[PDB]
Design an enzyme around this catalytic site. Structure first.
Site, PDB file in Angstrom:
ATOM      1  N   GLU A 135       0.834  -1.227   0.000  1.00 55.96           N
ATOM      2  CA  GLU A 135       0.000   0.000   0.000  1.00 55.96           C
ATOM      3  C   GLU A 135       0.858   1.261   0.000  1.00 55.96           C
ATOM      4  O   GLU A 135       0.710   2.127   0.868  1.00 55.96           O
ATOM      5  CB  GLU A 135      -0.939   0.030   1.233  1.00 55.96           C
ATOM      6  CG  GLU A 135      -1.698  -1.252   1.494  1.00 55.96           C
ATOM      7  CD  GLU A 135      -2.796  -1.040   2.521  1.00 55.96           C
ATOM      8  OE1 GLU A 135      -2.675  -0.081   3.330  1.00 55.96           O
ATOM      9  OE2 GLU A 135      -3.775  -1.823   2.505  1.00 55.96           O
ATOM     10  N   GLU A 234      -5.095  -9.368   2.608  1.00 58.73           N
ATOM     11  CA  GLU A 234      -5.814  -9.221   3.882  1.00 58.73           C
ATOM     12  C   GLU A 234      -7.302  -9.366   3.574  1.00 58.73           C
ATOM     13  O   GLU A 234      -7.752  -8.960   2.506  1.00 58.73           O
ATOM     14  CB  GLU A 234      -5.581  -7.830   4.549  1.00 58.73           C
ATOM     15  CG  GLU A 234      -4.180  -7.634   5.178  1.00 58.73           C
ATOM     16  CD  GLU A 234      -3.816  -6.175   5.494  1.00 58.73           C
ATOM     17  OE1 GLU A 234      -4.744  -5.329   5.637  1.00 58.73           O
ATOM     18  OE2 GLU A 234      -2.581  -5.907   5.613  1.00 58.73           O
TER      19      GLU A 234
HETATM   20  O1  LIG Z   1       2.713   8.227   4.436  1.00 56.95           O
HETATM   21  C1  LIG Z   1       3.885   9.049   4.484  1.00 56.95           C
HETATM   22  C2  LIG Z   1       4.794   8.547   5.611  1.00 56.95           C
HETATM   23  O2  LIG Z   1       5.384   7.317   5.151  1.00 56.95           O
HETATM   24  C3  LIG Z   1       6.304   6.733   6.120  1.00 56.95           C
HETATM   25  O3  LIG Z   1       6.853   5.510   5.614  1.00 56.95           O
HETATM   26  C4  LIG Z   1       5.821   4.540   5.503  1.00 56.95           C
HETATM   27  C5  LIG Z   1       6.217   3.292   6.308  1.00 56.95           C
HETATM   28  O4  LIG Z   1       6.170   3.585   7.697  1.00 56.95           O
HETATM   29  C6  LIG Z   1       5.278   2.142   5.978  1.00 56.95           C
HETATM   30  O5  LIG Z   1       5.755   0.965   6.645  1.00 56.95           O
HETATM   31  C7  LIG Z   1       4.941  -0.163   6.378  1.00 56.95           C
HETATM   32  C8  LIG Z   1       4.046  -0.361   7.614  1.00 56.95           C
HETATM   33  O6  LIG Z   1       3.117   0.746   7.746  1.00 56.95           O
HETATM   34  C9  LIG Z   1       3.316  -1.709   7.499  1.00 56.95           C
HETATM   35  O7  LIG Z   1       2.483  -1.863   8.646  1.00 56.95           O
HETATM   36  C10 LIG Z   1       1.603  -2.992   8.531  1.00 56.95           C
HETATM   37  C11 LIG Z   1       0.200  -2.452   8.233  1.00 56.95           C
HETATM   38  O8  LIG Z   1       0.176  -1.930   6.902  1.00 56.95           O
HETATM   39  C12 LIG Z   1      -0.862  -3.547   8.402  1.00 56.95           C
HETATM   40  O9  LIG Z   1      -2.168  -2.972   8.244  1.00 56.95           O
HETATM   41  O10 LIG Z   1      -0.724  -4.163   9.735  1.00 56.95           O
HETATM   42  C13 LIG Z   1       0.560  -4.832   9.870  1.00 56.95           C
HETATM   43  C14 LIG Z   1       0.511  -5.714  11.122  1.00 56.95           C
HETATM   44  O11 LIG Z   1       0.157  -4.907  12.230  1.00 56.95           O
HETATM   45  C15 LIG Z   1       1.632  -3.721   9.880  1.00 56.95           C
HETATM   46  O12 LIG Z   1       2.965  -4.218  10.168  1.00 56.95           O
HETATM   47  O13 LIG Z   1       4.322  -2.767   7.419  1.00 56.95           O
HETATM   48  C16 LIG Z   1       5.032  -2.700   6.139  1.00 56.95           C
HETATM   49  C17 LIG Z   1       5.914  -3.974   5.982  1.00 56.95           C
HETATM   50  O14 LIG Z   1       6.870  -4.013   7.047  1.00 56.95           O
HETATM   51  C18 LIG Z   1       5.849  -1.376   6.089  1.00 56.95           C
HETATM   52  O15 LIG Z   1       6.437  -1.222   4.794  1.00 56.95           O
HETATM   53  O16 LIG Z   1       5.372   1.960   4.537  1.00 56.95           O
HETATM   54  C19 LIG Z   1       4.795   3.049   3.783  1.00 56.95           C
HETATM   55  C20 LIG Z   1       4.747   2.690   2.293  1.00 56.95           C
HETATM   56  O17 LIG Z   1       5.935   2.001   1.938  1.00 56.95           O
HETATM   57  C21 LIG Z   1       5.684   4.273   4.014  1.00 56.95           C
HETATM   58  O18 LIG Z   1       5.135   5.439   3.358  1.00 56.95           O
HETATM   59  C22 LIG Z   1       7.463   7.677   6.435  1.00 56.95           C
HETATM   60  O19 LIG Z   1       8.250   7.119   7.478  1.00 56.95           O
HETATM   61  C23 LIG Z   1       6.935   9.042   6.892  1.00 56.95           C
HETATM   62  O20 LIG Z   1       8.038   9.948   6.979  1.00 56.95           O
HETATM   63  C24 LIG Z   1       5.881   9.595   5.912  1.00 56.95           C
HETATM   64  O21 LIG Z   1       5.283  10.771   6.471  1.00 56.95           O
END
Ligand SMILES: OC[C@H]1O[C@@H](O[C@@H]2[C@@H](O)[C@H](O[C@@H]3[C@@H](O)[C@H](O[C@@H]4[C@@H](O)[C@H](O)O[C@H](CO)[C@H]4O)O[C@H](CO)[C@H]3O)O[C@H](CO)[C@H]2O)[C@H](O)[C@@H](O)[C@@H]1O
Ligand SMILES: OC[C@H]1O[C@@H](O[C@@H]2[C@@H](O)[C@H](O[C@@H]3[C@@H](O)[C@H](O)O[C@H](CO)[C@H]3O)O[C@H](CO)[C@H]2O)[C@H](O)[C@@H](O)[C@@H]1O
EC number: 2.4.1.-
Length: 432
Positions: A135, A234
């Site tokens: 996403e 999901e």
């Molecule tokens: O939107 C702008 C901001 O983006 C920030 O970077 C994000 C990054 O934090 C995100 O990491 C994802 C996690 O969010 C993801 O969480 C999972 C959930 O999506 C799901 O619903 O639940 C599971 C289980 O609880 C969660 O682990 O996990 C994935 C895989 O590890 C991570 O990639 O990814 C975003 C898109 O790549 C990314 O935009 C950034 O740090 C901020 O500076 C910015 O403002």
């Protein structure tokens, strides 16, 4: 022994058990606990070994894991999963190292994270596949992130291809935003670089819904003939509780079984979000929640009728969506493969450096008003990527800092930025 989990391979738009040739359907559940920021349950036997008996009761053959620590061993948990016939779908990113959807980059730092996870996890036959993103683009305001995700897919697949490892497929997991979903799906199979599989975070079916009214029939028609395996990465809308999970009856039923490769319920652990089927108590034990029995009964009933590899074989370029401002801004042209050796050269030869050890934005604004930062900009809308746009944020900053230093030309070892993280690189003085 991995005997109970033969490697799964992809043929066309379906998964197959490489040993038996039978179509593989995912009956899964997300499995992720929430000095790393994330918790790697697969690196800790006392956790995975606690939960596997419960996972076995649910009748799942697949877990989705969002974050592992590649510095830790995973063989105990991976073997214990295999002994129960369970496979793992695994994200390559982690929350602190992911493609930033609002300010995207595809660089050495994120690519190194991806490679480390690949090297940590590829020895296991029950590693079903890797997600190169989850996403990232999530609506019409950030579609320009998708070219970076596509480059990641390309580079992860090539890194796997050039390694000694089994060629574990690399795919993408997407959300379900109406305005972007058709474009996203096409984009990830368009041109020369394609996802190997495609997972959708699917929450359209809530409570006691139906195939027609939920939207499932419309989604099924939309993905009919899509060239790569597709599944619900999901599912499990929690609007109505306890979740009856009647969508599972539809997903594995005749109409959907011909299109979808199954899906993974969200999720195992209850985290004050009302999405769990178990809750870990204060004694670290598993308390089964009302949803658990419904998911268990639905999976138990689910008997998808698939087609065999041999019969599928004897049965059988995508245009990228056009660009439209405010609607679809993902260029077909992708950023370059990040080059660790090129970028490492900056660490060695630049006179002025910023250590990794709020700040970034301020310093870019300052520096990029004094020197031309084109060489580190990456534009997914126009498909223009500067020569060092694949280097780490600190390397990109150091380059501009050094340009300013050379522009000033004082040649007095004073780097033109007052900050504890700035230093003059003494190696810069050494002739190559
Ligand atoms: O939107 C702008 C901001 O983006 C920030 O970077 C994000 C990054 O934090 C995100 O990491 C994802 C996690 O969010 C993801 O969480 C999972 C959930 O999506 C799901 O619903 O639940 C599971 C289980 O609880 C969660 O682990 O996990 C994935 C895989 O590890 C991570 O990639 O990814 C975003 C898109 O790549 C990314 O935009 C950034 O740090 C901020 O500076 C910015 O403002
Ligand atoms: O709007 C962006 C948002 O879309 C979310 O996907 C939505 C679904 O949530 C929605 O599901 C509806 C049910 O909630 C409702 O009870 O029933 C109706 C059918 O009668 C369902 O459609 O359906 C729409 C369109 O199909 C989806 O776009 C995504 O999960 C989320 O990613 C996104 O931000």
């Amino acid at each position: 022994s991995f005997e109970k989990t033969p490697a799964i391979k992809i043929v066309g738009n379906k998964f197959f058990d490489s040993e038996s040739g039978e179509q593989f359907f995912i009956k899964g559940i997300a499995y992720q606990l929430q000095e790393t920021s994330y918790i790697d349950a697969l690196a800790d036997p006392k956790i995975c070994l606690r939960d596997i008996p419960f996972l076995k009761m649910l009748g799942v053959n697949t877990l989705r894991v969002y974050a592992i620590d590649p510095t830790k061993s995973h063989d105990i948990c991976m073997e214990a999963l295999s002994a129960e016939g369970m496979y793992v779908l695994l994200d390559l990113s982690e929350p602190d190292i992911s493609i930033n959807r609002e300010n995207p980059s595809w660089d050495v730092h994120i690519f190194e994270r991806y490679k480390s996870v690949i090297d940590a996890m590829s020895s296991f036959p029950n590693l079903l596949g890797y997600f190169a993103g989850n996403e990232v683009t999530n609506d019409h305001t950030n579609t320009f992130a998708s070219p970076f995700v596509k480059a990641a897919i390309r580079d992860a697949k090539e890194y796997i291809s050039h390694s000694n490892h089994r060629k574990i497929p690399v795919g993408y997991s997407t959300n379900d935003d109406a305005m972007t979903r058709d474009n996203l799906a096409r984009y990830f199979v368009c041109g020369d670089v394609k996802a190997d599989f495609y997972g959708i975070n699917m929450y359209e079916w809530c409570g006691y819904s139906t195939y027609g009214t939920s939207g499932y029939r419309e989604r099924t028609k939309e993905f009919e003939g899509y060239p790569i395996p597709v599944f619900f990465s999901e599912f499990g809308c929690n609007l109505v509780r306890p979740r009856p999970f009647t969508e599972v009856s539809a997903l594995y039923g005749n109409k959907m079984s011909s299109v979808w490769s199954g899906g993974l319920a969200y999720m195992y652990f209850e985290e004050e979000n009302e999405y769990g089927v178990v809750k870990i108590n204060d004694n670290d034990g598993v308390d089964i929640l009302p949803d658990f029995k419904n998911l268990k009964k639905e999976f138990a009933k689910a008997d998808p009728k698939g087609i065999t590899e041999e019969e599928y074989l004897t049965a059988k370029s995508v245009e990228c969506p056009h660009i439209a401002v405010g609607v679809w801004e993902a260029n077909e042209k992708l950023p370059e493969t990040p080059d660790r050796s090129k970028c490492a050269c900056l660490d060695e030869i630049l006179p002025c450096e910023i250590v990794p050890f709020g700040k970034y934005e301020e310093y870019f604004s300052y520096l990029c008003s004094k020197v031309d930062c084109s060489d580190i900009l990456a534009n997914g809308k126009t498909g223009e990527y500067g020569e060092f746009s694949d280097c780490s944020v600190e390397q990109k900053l150091s380059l501009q800092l050094s340009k300013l230093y050379c522009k000033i030309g004082a040649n007095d070892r004073h780097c033109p930025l007052n900050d504890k993280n700035v230093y003059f690189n003494l190696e810069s003085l050494q002739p190559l």
